[PDB]
Amino acid sequence: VRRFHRHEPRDHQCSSAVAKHIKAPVHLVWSLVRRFDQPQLFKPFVSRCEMKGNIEIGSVREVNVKSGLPATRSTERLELLDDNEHILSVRFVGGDHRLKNYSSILTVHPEVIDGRPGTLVIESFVVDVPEGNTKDETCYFVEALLKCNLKSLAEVSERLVV
Amino acid sequence: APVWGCASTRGRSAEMEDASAAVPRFADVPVRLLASRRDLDALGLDADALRLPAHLFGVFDGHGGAEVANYCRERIHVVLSAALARLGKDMKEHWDDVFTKCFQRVDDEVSGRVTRVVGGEVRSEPVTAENVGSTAVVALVCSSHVVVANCGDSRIVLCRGKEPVALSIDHKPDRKDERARIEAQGGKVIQWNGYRVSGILAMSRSIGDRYLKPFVIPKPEVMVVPRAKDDDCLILASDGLWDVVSNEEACKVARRQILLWHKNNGSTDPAAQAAADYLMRLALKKGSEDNITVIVVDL
Ligand SMILES: O=S(=O)(NCc1ccccn1)c1ccc(Br)c2ccccc12
Numbered sequence A: 001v002r003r004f005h006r007h008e009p010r011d012h013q014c015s016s017a018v019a020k021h022i023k024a025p026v027h028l029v030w031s032l033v034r035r036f037d038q039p040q041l042f043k044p045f046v047s048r049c050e051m052k053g054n055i056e057i058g059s060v061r062e063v064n065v066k067s068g069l070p071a072t073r074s075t076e077r078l079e080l081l082d083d084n085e086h087i088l089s090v091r092f093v094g095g096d097h098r099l100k101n102y103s104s105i106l107t108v109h110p111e112v113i114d115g116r117p118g119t120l121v122i123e124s125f126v127v128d129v130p131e132g133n134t135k136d137e138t139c140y141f142v143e144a145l146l147k148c149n150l151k152s153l154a155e156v157s158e159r160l161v162v
Numbered sequence B: 001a002p003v004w005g006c007a008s009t010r011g012r013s014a015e016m017e018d019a020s021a022a023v024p025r026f027a028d029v030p031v032r033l034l035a036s037r038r039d040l041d042a043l044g045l046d047a048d049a050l051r052l053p054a055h056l057f058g059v060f061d062g063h064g065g066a067e068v069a070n071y072c073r074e075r076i077h078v079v080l081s082a083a084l085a086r087l088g089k090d091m092k093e094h095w096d097d098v099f100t101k102c103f104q105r106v107d108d109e110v111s112g113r114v115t116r117v118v119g120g121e122v123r124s125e126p127v128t129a130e131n132v133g134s135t136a137v138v139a140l141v142c143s144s145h146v147v148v149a150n151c152g153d154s155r156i157v158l159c160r161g162k163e164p165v166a167l168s169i170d171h172k173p174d175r176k177d178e179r180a181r182i183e184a185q186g187g188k189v190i191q192w193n194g195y196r197v198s199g200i201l202a203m204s205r206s207i208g209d210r211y212l213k214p215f216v217i218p219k220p221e222v223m224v225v226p227r228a229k230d231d232d233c234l235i236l237a238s239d240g241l242w243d244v245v246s247n248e249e250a251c252k253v254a255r256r257q258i259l260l261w262h263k264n265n266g267s268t269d270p271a272a273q274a275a276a277d278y279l280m281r282l283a284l285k286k287g288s289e290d291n292i293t294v295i296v297v298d299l
């Protein structure tokens, strides 16, 4: 399940992936992820998010993040949303986050966890390494934020199954 | 008995996540932490029974939200007082131990690892989300000593008599002993608009932020300073002030605002409140975009 998460980063780009197993059915987890206009639903770093019009390919949301972070704003563009295959692709097109040409692929797959309905979520990305940082630093920084967001998605999904 | 002022504001910031505390006579300190057994034994006053009242001042710069800073204002002095009262039943080591166990207990309460009292019932869930945290710089002020415990990038500065002298060092990730501790645990300190743990948090020590665990710890840094007939004032402030005002700049202004109130004129104290108000507005006029919180304690 990395036909969707295989990347060819250039020499001055870095790529990685993070995964998370969620004790909730895929339909519930995907219904959270699909809501492109409300990332605050499971991302604790988001304090507001605006996007004009309906959710469609090419839609752009303007994300404001809370205090205690290196960035404050981020402009992100919906590249792919497959509601049948549960694939969400986003591209960063602005913001003070220093993550340029950031492209990411999120997929959610069915799994049995402890005999009950579960979910595997995988988010991979490619991004330019900004000058003055290493590939190991850029990956570690992005993975840490993605890991916190997937853990919060797991908590949100599992406390809506109760 | 204590003489202080306190000023705080959003500033240009969207939301207010700073908090402060000023608790007079919050506890009684066992004097064996403030005087040699043999210097009090010379007066026949064995310090194992003596205690002296003390006042608690604290500033708590929250991030990710204000719920953790507000919790520190409500809870840290209560936990400190219960900790002092039982210790009475090397003194530098003892000060570090009572402050370390107090900060750890509050951190464990914030993160939901231990239960907390609310009424007579108990709550065990975390106080708020995983990304919410707060600095904590507290000043224990009694007649003989000022005891400072610092956790984060807030700062307390003493004016004695014209020097600023820093009673706390900012817990920035690039700071050498902090970077070494973080990397020894397999972590990383990354420059990403400033040096940050995992490239995210601009501090290596705080209350809360359970998602940056075990790299961001609640261990406070303690400094015991005896009061010498020379001190002017204490200045506790979030980095909203220290980002645009230096230790020299803040000390000379606070010490002068106190003097100009008493030559012009005869809860908070008006002269010290004027110093805190002036320092807050001064930071506003020098281009500070953060929350501002200033406590001035007239010694
Ligand atoms: O909205 S997020 O919660 N998405 C998670 C995320 C973060 C970073 C990269 C990819 N994906 C977010 C949090 C913190 C920072 Br710093 C961000 C900076 C730019 C864009 C989004 C940012």
Ligand SMILES: [Mg+2]
Pocket (backbone or CB within 6 Å): A067, B017, B018, B061, B062, B063, B291
């Ligand atoms: Mg703050």
Ligand SMILES: [Mg+2]
Pocket (backbone or CB within 6 Å): B061, B238, B239, B240, B290, B291
């Ligand atoms: Mg601040």
